[PDB]
Every structure is written in structure tokens, then in C-alpha cells.
């Protein structure tokens, strides 16, 4: 059984960044051959050149898929910080794998504004590597509890993107698939 890497990249819909989708690939040969012959603008890697992976047997391969802005792609690299790196998708400094990204302006955007994608903008503390919270509880900035009412000094954390086809590249939606390598003997 070759690996289901086709159905990860060609999925109709990708998850939002505050609630990214973790797929587990195992018990299957993996033709990373396509991984190096696509025209996926960022096939960046951190420690494992794509050439040796087809000679390595990995116990588990995890594919984390989500949609972010073009100017947020750099926050997916290890060692980076920012609103995405710290509050949505935290990747460890000791990262083994590759980050693949491509423009999806014709897929994930509409004229009226695509608001189906939402990221976290406020949180009490920064995230640890590979963890995520999907809590929508009201964030209090001030000295007085609002008990769920978003009044002054209380905010709804999960803000939303509004992707539109005419935005500049940095504000266009990008589909990101992070392949983390921890049963999967590549040919």
C-alpha cells in the first residue's frame, strides 16, 4: 500500500491555523519522488535532505495541514516567533522534517470575503511545540471579570481572516503542509 500523500495535498479543504489538522501516515511505502518534482513554491527542509528520506525507514510521518497568510509562512520555520508561531502553530527548535507551501488564492478566497478561516490573536501564554487549544473563552485584558461578555477590556480571542482574490501576495492564502518525521520505509 503506497502512502496516502496524494489525498493530503489534493484535499478540497484545509483546516484553520488555530485548529490545524494532524494526519498520521504509517504502514506504507512512500514515494517522496513527487516531493522534489512539483512547481509547491517552498519545499524547505531542516536537517533531512529530501534525497535520503527515500532510503530511511521512519516510524511515523505526520502531516500538519492548515491555511495562513503569505507573509506568515516564515513563522512556520523553527526558531521563529510571532502571532502564528506563538499562539497558533508552535514548531520546536529541534525540528526534523520539511515545510511545503503553495499559493491557493483561487481555491480559498471569494469576492464577498472568505471568513471561514480563523486564527488566535490573544492568549494568556505562549504555546509549547505541537500543542493546540481551540477554546473560545473570553480573554480579559483588564482588572475586572466580564463573565463572558465582550465589553471593555474583554475580547473574543479567535479573530478571522477575510481572504479576497484581489489582495497583495503577502495577504493571499497559502496552504501549508508540514511533514514531521518521528513503519514508513521510503523506497
Amino acid at each position, epitope marked *: 500500500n*503506497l502512502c*496516502p500523500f496524494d489525498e493530503v495535498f489534493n484535499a478540497t479543504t484545509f483546516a484553520s491555523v488555530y485548529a490545524w489538522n494532524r494526519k498520521r501516515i504509517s504502514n506504507c511505502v512512500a514515494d517522496y519522488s513527487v516531493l522534489y518534482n512539483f512547481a509547491f513554491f517552498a519545499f524547505k527542509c531542516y536537517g533531512v535532505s529530501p534525497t535520503k528520506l527515500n532510503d530511511l525507514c521512519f516510524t511515523n510521518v505526520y502531516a500538519d495541514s492548515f491555511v495562513i497568510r503569505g507573509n506568515e509562512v516564515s513563522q512556520i520555520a523553527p526558531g521563529q516567533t510571532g502571532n502564528i508561531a506563538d499562539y497558533n502553530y508552535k514548531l520546536p527548535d529541534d525540528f526534523t522534517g520539511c515545510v511545503i507551501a503553495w499559493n491557493s488564492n*483561487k481555491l480559498d478566497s471569494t469576492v464577498g470575503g472568505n471568513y471561514n478561516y480563523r486564527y488566535r490573536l490573544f492568549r494568556k501564554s505562549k504555546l509549547k511545540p505541537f500543542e493546540r487549544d481551540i477554546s473560545t473563552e473570553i480573554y480579559q485584558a483588564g482588572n475586572k471579570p466580564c463573565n463572558g461578555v465582550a465589553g471593555v477590556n474583554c475580547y473574543f480571542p479567535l479573530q478571522s481572516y477575510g481572504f479576497r482574490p484581489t489582495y497583495g501576495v503577502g495577504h493571499q492564502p497559502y496552504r501549508v503542509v508540514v511533514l514531521s518525521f518521528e513503519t514508513v520505509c521510503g523506497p
Partner: antibody
Amino acid sequence: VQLVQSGAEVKKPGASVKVSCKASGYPFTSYGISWVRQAPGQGLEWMGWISTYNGNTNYAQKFQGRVTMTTDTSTTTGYMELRRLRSDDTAVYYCARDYTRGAWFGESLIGGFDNWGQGTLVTV
Amino acid sequence: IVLTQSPGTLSLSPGERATLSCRASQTVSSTSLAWYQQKPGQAPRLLIYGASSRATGIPDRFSGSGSGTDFTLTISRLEPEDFAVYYCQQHDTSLTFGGGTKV
């Protein structure tokens, strides 16, 4: 990549028909199998989809109960078995290889029906 | 969702442009729509997928586009071999085909 279906059959009302489909030229367990149907003078009518890996099946709304789908990996052959044939069940049942749903995760894909067989005519 | 195609019989002279439409009763994903072409006496083939992406092996005279509830297919120059029956499909919800049109 080819799909080869069985020959035509004639059945009486109330009988069941089992239509086979032979697939070759590609990794069997990487793609699902779908069964659209076209009756004389009509357009196409989806009957259902079956995974070749997990065995999961997704049926069209008005075929649930009669249609039954199965695959055999060792001989890379699919099967479809409609049941309680009615007079309206006369048509040509096509075997198709799909790229509309993932075979392993069951998630919807961007694609269509890549390869169609010659069509099996069932008379009733 | 219910798909309706028009005109039912877009039979025009070869060498000219032929445009088909497919309307949806509900908004559908632009990546979940496809077009098929069925020649007389045989099985249909995938022509376009993902609304606009051309299927492999298909001539570049075929082009698709659309969004929302209004999708179209255009042939830049109709050939003698293009006088076939075309169908639109969506698989955003379940899977359904349109009525089909004859060119």
C-alpha cells in the same frame, strides 16, 4: 490504466445482478471505485463509492438497501450487486476509478472520475 | 444540490465557439465541480476538474471557469469530434450530475 467489465446479462424482476470490474495499470489500493449508471435516453445517476483500503462505502440516497459493494485486492477486481431489480432498473452500469474521495482518510478530493469501463448492459 | 444545464441542445456549426452553462440551486465549492464528455456509443471521459483544471490527455481548446452558483465551459473552436453530450458534476455534497447537453 484500464477497466474491464463483464458482459451483458438478462434478469427477471425481483432478481439480483452482480457486475464485476477488473482494474489494472495502477496501484489498486491508492484509488477508490465508483459506480455511475445510465439508462437509455437518460443522463448519468450515481449509485455509490467504495474504498479499496478500508472497505468503507458511501451510497446514493435512493439505492441504500438494494446496492451492495465489495472489492477483492488479491485479484484487483471490484464488484457491485444491485438487488430486487425493478423494471426501471434497466440500464448500462459503468465502473469508474475516482479521484473524488481519498481511499485512506475518506476526505473529499479535487478531481473527478478518471477512467471509465466500457459499460455493462443489464436487461430487466 | 441540483444542477441544471442549458441550452439542452447547443448544436451549432463547426469552426465557431460553443459555450455551455451549469447552474446550481445552491452555492458549491469551486474545487468540487467537474465536466464530462460522452461520445455516442461509448463511455464518458473526464474533461475538466476543479472547475477550471484541464484533465490529462485533453486538448487545449477546452477551457472551464466559474464560481458560486454559475459555472461554464467553453470550446474556442468547435471540432467535428466535439459533437457529443456534455455533463456537469458536483461532489461538494454527496455526488450529483446535471441533465446534460448535446452539441
